[PDB]
């Protein structure tokens, strides 16, 4: 049974990106599986390093103890939901009394607890904190990773326009701060931050870090709510660290009142609550008294925690091996989910048109699983006005929740300006001009084709329901002689023209817009297509054409154009704009179409 | 247990990209699938279509028979060879008396016949035939794949653009005939040919086709060797079809002395040869005689292969249906390998620089497995010279045999002029001044990785013997800041300048090149690199460099340098050629010091 988890040793990887596959036996625990993950790179420690699962698309974990099967915590927890929604997590979770001494005898753990907990940092707290502590952090972190450059390195303009045109620090700095400063600013700041620090190594900027981050969170521990008291029970927030021992909050910044120390515990056990409450129990025995100690945390699932959490204190700063929570294997080094997008993976290319956000590019991508992948980029000339923003940024949340093969897919954004897209790429681009160039040459089996391909995926959106209102062929797009996707989802508001030969007579009139009008705008695609690109009423007015509706009059048949197939253009040509028949039925009987086609 | 067959029937991907998966259980038999497979097309057909294995690098196929297990000759065969060096076949072997007509009244089986046996022609008879039976062909091939389209369609200079510009007839006609003609000509041969046939349809030339393959190929049968005689035993070449019975061949062109015929056939049984000879006997059973026909072939594999033939010639033409070999399954339809290279797939990008074969571009390239990807295109400015071609071949090829991540890998050619190359994309392009611009910047560990994964490249060249001689940083070419591969590999002689700071003394001398002047080469481009792109003797010429390497000056150090890399880059700098170390010796060396530099 072979297994991949993220590990925070480094490589060349993202900082974030730091992967490895483990092959093991059933035999295999959690604790096994560590000893290899740390022998792959010699660090100091047996009991330090626990492991976490974790869900992707929510803030829940389970950290899991040593001696579980590792198949079988795959089966208990991914029959619960698919392997997109768990994620293994190597992690620290303990620390000694003085863990910067302990553990600063222990450089690649120091370099492993830093990058952790920095890493915590920027995900929780980088947006909040002070400028002055960011910089504080940044350029202490660009001592780290710069360890043999200069103290006068970033005194340039030349390397200003590195920091900047390379670079860039969303890896280090937060949105917060960087959208809120002048380039000019910012540069002074990072200057004037970078002259102190100038001259630090590793090991000295990294316990700095550790007292810059003391004074806005206390990482020595974590933080947990409970209510204790056998006989009248009492809310606390239990957050318990090695600093303590074991104590409690009554105010914010108040030092703990103490309790206990990790040296004075005993034993472990725990079970569910006395009712059906979703919650569990957790008794405990510390050092001589006749006295358990019973916390009641909200789940079950942190009633283990904190059992895992003791017990791995015990052993941490005992010898303690064996658990005590009272209740050839061998492993070697070989769908939905949370998408992050960066900016140095990209080709910036070419101008491929002017659309309507504004001008387009073309690029490429890279990315671990899949790379180097080239792609449409779809702009806007200004991105002044937030309105335009929220549209650009609605198209794309509108696109991302579908899941299809011929809806045309978006990757992901790049949410700084100039925001940018990850279409992956219109090739052959606008159908209309490449049918009209491609007009003596065509198959209409492959129009055929065509129509059936937008029934699925216009049956798909109504499976899901939106509502275009603007479907055209200019909107369509293209991939191949064998692949066109749905392209565009985009809103604009509100006034003249509009593509009303492609419009139904009811939202021409009063603007209604529903399943009909869709059929219409459905039907008018079709058949364009099927024209071999010809337009409805060459040189005549948009004003007239609701008026030959409303008198009947409709668009004639192609020439050669299959029987079946125009019959089901005027089941869609029905006046009564709710009797124009379902996407489903399009559906099916385009099917049957292309079935007997392909039977000649 | 799932499989997957190429078949022929007919979609939008290409004439020979006819492809399913089909998914069944261990009961299913070769019979049993092609129930499904012509059930997914209505067939007229329940005993005819036959299953044919094959090897991909090879001319050797095996037909099988109907009652075997699929995963019993899964087995039995890929236990010899790879997947990748095996391939079933779907496809036609048997032909019931007037073909043309049992299976005229049976279109899909007219078609499916029809690109079968027109693949097998273009396949090895193509490139053979007269240019006026190839125009015949193609022209009734027009005809075919164009049902609907006009008599005079092709009448026009805008037809010609398309069919040249778009697209092009490497599917339709041979190597052999398009390499040999004017580009007016061809419009011309191709103009009075269509005019003929204008107004056929899919049956009438159809029959056509296969009354012009009929002169040049009697593909009503197969033609084998064989040696028959009980007592005295005689070479033959036992070529056996529906058209004829049972006969052979004493001359070329002779009518086949006849001997038997298939309603005459009462039984088969095969074994292997009388002798350790690696062949296989074969008796039958003909109507009304004491007699038995005995053929004897190169092959056991033959000798099964024939026994099918007479067996399914029974279920053909009889109503046979239990093997005359005397010795809930349901399948629902869901490394090292040819490459078939196209040129419809293809982007025409920019200018990317200006090479040695010539100017070079960047495109895409699209297929089944993966597409869409992104490449650069390397190309040439003349194509005038077959030297330069087969240099511009020899490089590809050479870089062929490889199989390694960090080779720079082609993936193939269009061979016809303007012949061009699918490189891989060398992303951030020329390291020279991409390090150049990226001074101050840049971390020395992955200048480390850099040599490490270059150390890994020439060491598997070297553990395949090719030489390279040229080596530099400006034929070292990027990927990313975590992939460097190696690039070029070409062929150029014979004057000067040549690269002689980068080159060794022996071959400054006297043209000597092997492992010295390789490993001494490497050590420059190390160095180079590790420079930060510091040319060696800025201003000096290329004559002193030879005296002062005689006299031993070597490179300083650079400044920073860690004590194992220089340490190595001496070793490396034995002035003794032979004496300095190997390129295994570099792999463990620069493993080893990465290892402590991650170590810290």
Not at 192 to 215: W, Y
Not at 282 to 305: F, R, W
Request: one cysteine or more; a neutral charge; aromatic letters at 10%.
């Amino acid at each position: 049974r072979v297994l991949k988890v993220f590990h925070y040793f480094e490589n060349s990887s993202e900082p974030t990106t730091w992967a490895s596959i483990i092959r093991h036996g059933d035999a295999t625990d959690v604790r096994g599986i560590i000893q290899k993950i740390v022998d792959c790179h010699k660090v100091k420690n047996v009991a330090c390093y626990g492991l976490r699962l974790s869900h992707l698309q929510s803030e829940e974990v389970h950290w899991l103890h040593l001696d579980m099967g590792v198949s079988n915590v795959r089966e208990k927890f991914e029959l619960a939901h698919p392997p997109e929604e768990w994620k293994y997590e190597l992690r620290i979770r303990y620390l000694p009394k003085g863990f910067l001494n302990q553990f600063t005898e222990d450089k690649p753990t120091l370099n492993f607890f830093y990058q952790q907990v920095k890493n915590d940092y920027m995900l929780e707290i980088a947006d909040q904190v002070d400028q002055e502590i960011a910089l504080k952090l940044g350029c202490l972190e660009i001592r780290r990773s710069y360890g043999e450059m200069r103290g006068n390195a970033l005194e340039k303009k030349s390397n200003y326009e590195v920091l900047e045109k390379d670079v860039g620090l969303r890896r280090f700095f937060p949105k917060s701060l960087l959208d809120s400063v002048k380039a000019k600013t910012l540069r002074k700041l990072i200057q004037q931050t970078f002259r102190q620090f100038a001259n630090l190594n590793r090991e000295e900027s990294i316990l700095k870090f550790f007292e810059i981050l003391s004074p806005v969170y206390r990482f020595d521990k974590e933080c947990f709510k409970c209510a204790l008291g056998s006989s009248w029970i009492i809310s606390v927030e239990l957050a318990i660290g090695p600093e303590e021992g074991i104590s409690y909050l009554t105010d914010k910044g108040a030092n703990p009142t103490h309790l206990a120390d990790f040296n004075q515990v005993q034993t472990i056990q725990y079970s569910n609550s006395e009712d059906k409450d979703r919650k569990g129990m957790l008794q405990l025995k510390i050092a001589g008294a006749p006295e358990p100690l019973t916390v009641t945390a909200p789940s079950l699932t942190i009633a283990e925690n904190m059992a895992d959490l003791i017990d791995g204190y015990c052993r941490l700063v005992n010898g303690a091996t064996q658990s005590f929570i009272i209740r050839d294997d061998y492993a070697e080094i070989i769908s939905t989910r949370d998408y992050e997008i960066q900016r140095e993976r990209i080709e910036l290319g070419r101008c491929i048109g002017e659309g309507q956000f504004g001008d387009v590019h073309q690029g490429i991508y890279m990315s671990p699983e899949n790379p180097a992948m080239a792609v449409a980029i779809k702009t806007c000339k200004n991105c002044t006005s937030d309105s335009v923003r929220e549209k650009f940024l609605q198209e794309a949340l509108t696109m991302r929740q579908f899941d299809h093969p011929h809806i045309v897919k978006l990757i992901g954004v790049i949410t700084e300006n100039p925001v940018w897209i990850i279409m992956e790429l219109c090739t052959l681009g606008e159908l209309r001009s490449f049918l009209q160039v491609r007009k003596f040459s065509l198959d209409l089996a492959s129009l055929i084709l065509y129509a059936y391909q937008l029934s699925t995926a216009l049956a798909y959106l109504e499976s899901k329901r939106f509502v275009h209102r603007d479907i055209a062929a200019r909107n369509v797009l293209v991939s191949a002689t064998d692949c066109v996707k749905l392209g565009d989802f985009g809103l604009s508001r509100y006034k003249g023209k509009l593509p009303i030969k492609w419009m139904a007579p009811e939202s021409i009139n009063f603007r209604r817009f529903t399943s009909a009008s869709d059929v219409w705008m459905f039907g008018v695609c079709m058949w364009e297509i099927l024209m071999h690109g010809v337009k409805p009423f060459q040189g005549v007015k948009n004003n007239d054409v609701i008026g030959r509706i409303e008198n009947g009059e409709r668009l004639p048949m192609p020439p050669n154009c299959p029987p079946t197939l125009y019959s089901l253009m005027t089941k869609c040509w029905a006046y009564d704009p709710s009797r124009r028949p379902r996407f489903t039925e399009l559906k099916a009987q385009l099917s049957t179409i292309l079935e007997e086609e392909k039977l000649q």
